């Protein structure tokens, strides 16, 4: 049923691109208030350059931020999609 479910032509070896980084911008944008606060802390737990430095507002540096840290958000979102089922 996999073929009828989707196919997802997804590249794992894509070079640092703004579209690449920005794909994750749209994921964080879809996530609710509870999630944004949580994820931002997980992502920024890696980079010191994290949002900008200021922790009051949330502005994701990902244009200038590393693709390695980019993938952290990917992991999170993939987790959020399958763990949207709360208890």
């Amino acid at each position: 049923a996999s073929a009828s479910y989707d196919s997802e032509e997804e590249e794992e070896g894509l070079p640092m691109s703004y579209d690449e980084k920005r794909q994750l911008s749209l994921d964080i944008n879809r996530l609710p208030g509870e999630k944004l606060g949580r994820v931002v802390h997980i992502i920024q737990s890696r980079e010191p350059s994290l949002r900008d430095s200021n922790p009051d507002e949330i502005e994701i540096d990902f244009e200038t931020l590393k693709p390695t840290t980019l993938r952290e958000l990917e992991r999170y979102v993939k987790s959020c999609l399958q763990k949207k089922q709360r208890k």
């Binding site: 703004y18 964080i28 944004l36 990902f62 244009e63």
Partner: peptide, 12 residues
Amino acid sequence: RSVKVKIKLGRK
């Protein structure tokens, strides 16, 4: 930088 991924989660 160029195309901003600087989110600013528009919750409010």
